[PDB]
Design a protein around this ligand. Structure first.
Ligand code: L3A
Ligand code: ZN
Ligand code: ZN
Length: 309
């Protein structure tokens, strides 16, 4: 078996929505739960902070802080084993009996116009920040906004702070224009959950030009287990996920590929990747296609080679 790094799940959004109905220990309805993370042999799971687009502007910060509190109270020190990775040394020094968990921020909506709110989140240990979800916000346009604009000054100022703090700038969800501008501005670039658009043409995916640029930037691309972004017909299994891995390798990105499941953030599943406990069976499926060294690259080593430094 091999340890796993997965950059993106929406367990916090789901736990929050559940209103106490879900036990993180073992709830079957949670794609990511304690028992399943153990089964996965998880090394590091990214937990996104994300609010429904319908949480009003005046409550977004409160609800985000609530998610951070859910993380601290119900995820963290689960089994004593879940260990909060708040800085990159925490991961590099992680005890072998621990499973690392980091916070990431999916769109800067919760900070309003206040950079100090972002500072608070970074101090709290957020290690990757997506400037946008799908919508227009004060930092940039996300991919679903028809205007498709790039970065605002605020967006640029945010990226500068991220660079300074050795935090990833996450391009998943950005408009095409914001993507290109972000590559010029950001020092530590990741796509925490995006697939290849040549293989599945959803606008949420990255085209060949974008993928080549990511590689040139020495960025990480973390493939996502959502059938809608995996196959054009919307029905997908693990071999279909591998077609994206193949494609990125073909574009020169063997060492730039990781996993970003989007577990708990998706209405249906890739067959064979129904929940995070399926990870080990998926890695063995990979053995028909790639060497153990290459698979270890996808599972953890690529990400580990790209920590902000
Ligand atoms: C919690 C649900 C509603 C939204 C998630 N934050 P998502 O990560 O945006 C899932 C989606 C398919 C995507 O990645 O585009
Ligand atoms: Zn998410
Ligand atoms: Zn998302």
């Amino acid at each position: 078996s091999l340890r796993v790094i997965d950059t993106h799940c929406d367990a916090l959004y789901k736990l929050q929505a559940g209103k106490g109905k879900y036990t993180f220990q073992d709830a079957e309805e949670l794609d990511v739960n304690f028992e399943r993370l153990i089964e996965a042999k998880m090394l590091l799971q990214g937990f996104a902070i994300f609010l429904d687009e319908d949480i009003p502007v005046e409550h977004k910060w409160k609800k985000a802080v609530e998610q951070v509190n859910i993380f601290k109270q119900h995820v963290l020190h689960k089994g004593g084993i879940i260990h909060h990775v708040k800085k990159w040394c925490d991961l590099e020094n992680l005890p072998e009996d621990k499973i690392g968990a980091m916070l990431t921020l999916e769109g800067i909506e919760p900070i309003g116009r206040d950079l100090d709110k972002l500072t608070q989140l970074l101090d709290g240990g957020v290690l990757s920040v997506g400037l946008t979800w799908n919508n227009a916000n004060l930092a940039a346009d996300g991919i679903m906004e028809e205007r498709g604009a790039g970065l605002t000054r605020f967006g640029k100022d945010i990226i500068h702070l991220l660079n300074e703090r050795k935090v990833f700038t996450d391009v998943s969800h950005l408009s095409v224009k914001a993507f290109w501008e972000t590559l010029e501005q950001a020092e530590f670039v990741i796509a925490s959950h995006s697939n290849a658009k040549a293989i599945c043409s959803h606008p949420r995916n990255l085209d060949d030009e974008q993928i080549k640029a990511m590689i040139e930037h020495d960025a990480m691309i973390h493939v996502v287990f959502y059938p809608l972004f995996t196959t054009n017909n919307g029905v997908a299994d693990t071999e279909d996920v591998i077609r994206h891995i193949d494609h990125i390798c073909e574009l020169g990105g063997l060492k730039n590929i990781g996993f970003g499941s989007d577990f708990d953030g998706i209405p249906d599943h890739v067959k064979g990747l129904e929940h995070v406990g399926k990870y080990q069976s998926f890695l063995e499926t990979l053995e028909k296609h790639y060497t153990k060294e290459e698979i270890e690259g996808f599972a953890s080593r690529n990400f580990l080679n790209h920590l902000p430094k």
